[PDB]
Each structure stands twice: as C-alpha cells, then as structure tokens.
Design a protein around this ligand. Structure first.
Ligand code: 1XV
Length: 143
C-alpha cells in the first residue's frame, strides 16, 4: 500500500553500520537512507558517552539479545516518539549488530533486523505517518 517496505530501511542501515567497521563488503535516486545514515552518524558523535556506555554494557548472548532489545526500546520510547528517538533506535540496532559480529554471533544480525522491522511496522509506523512520513524526515534533515 505505502509503496515501500520498512525492512529495506532497516537492511540498508544495518549494512551501512557493518560496512563502516569493515564487517560487510561495500566499495563506499533514494534519499531516505542517506538522510538516516548521516543523522545517525551525527547522533553518535553528539551522544558519544551514551554510545560508548551502550557499546560496553550490552553483554549480548543468543538467549539474552531478544530481551535486551525489547527493554532498551521500551525505555527509548517511554515518553513518546520524535524523529531523534527514531534515529537513536536505528543507532541502537546498529550497536547490537556490531556487538553481535564482535562476539562471533553474526547470525543474530538477521534476528535484530527482524525485531527492528517489526517494531517500526507495529509501533512506530502510525507516528511516522501522522508526522508527515519519511518525506517529512527528509525535508527536515536531508540534503
Ligand atoms: O533532539 C532530539 N530529537 S529531535 O528534536 O527530534 C532531533 C533533533 C536534531 C536532529 N538532527 C540534528 C539537526 C542538526 O544537525 C545535526 C543533526 C534530529 N534528527 O532526527 O536528525 C532530531 C533527541 C536528542 C537526543 C535523544 N536521545 C534519546 C536516547 N538517549 C539515550 C538512550 C538510549 C540509547 C543509547 C545509545 C544508543 Cl547508540 C541509542 C540509544 C536507549 C535508551 O534510552 C536512552 C540519548 C538522547 C533523542 C532525541
């Protein structure tokens, strides 16, 4: 119906975060993916302390990742949604994927991509559509 699939925004974002570390191949039209990447890179520069704390406190394992993902996301959106919190959600998913590869649990990346897609589709999609859609995010933060 929308003409797009949020799974693609998730897959492209995770691919970019892994590629930045040399964890996935990338030699280095659509504007949403570039806008989101840039916003997330800036978010992690501004909130470097929160990023470093999140990157060392996760202690991810295959049985604990699901619960940790849900708990952090619930904390993130407890006071409501805005674009910055959506950018923070992608950055959090990125940290979970990078940590999963670091801990030799690369298959978890596919599960994290599914949980992010499901949360965007079921819990954030209404807010996004009510707030001008991805079009409004690009109008505010895009080139
Ligand atoms: O300002 C905000 N929102 S905004 O006004 O919508 C807005 C403004 C400007 C711009 N972009 C800028 C425009 C000017 O040029 C440069 C770009 C955009 N944007 O979308 O691009 C949107 C805003 C600020 C901070 C914020 N977080 C919330 C999360 N928290 C830590 C935390 C968790 C957490 C910890 C680590 C990691 Cl990796 C992830 C999550 C998980 C558990 O919970 C706590 C840290 C602070 C949320 C929203």
């Amino acid at each position: 119906r929308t003409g797009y699939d949020n799974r693609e925004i998730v897959m492209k974002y995770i691919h970019y975060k892994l590629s930045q570390r040399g964890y996935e191949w990338d030699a280095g039209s659509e504007v949403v993916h570039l806008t989101l990447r840039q916003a997330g890179d800036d978010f992690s520069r501004r909130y470097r302390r929160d990023f470093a704390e999140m990157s060392s406190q996760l202690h991810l394992t295959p049985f604990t990742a699901r619960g940790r993902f849900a708990t952090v996301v619930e904390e993130l959106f407890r006071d409501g949604v805005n674009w910055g919190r959506i950018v923070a959600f992608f950055e959090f998913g990125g940290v979970m994927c990078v940590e999963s590869v670091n801990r030799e649990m690369s298959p978890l990346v596919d599960n994290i991509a599914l949980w992010m897609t499901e949360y965007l589709n079921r819990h954030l999609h209404t807010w996004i559509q009510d707030n001008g859609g991805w079009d409004a995010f690009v109008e505010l933060y895009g080139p």
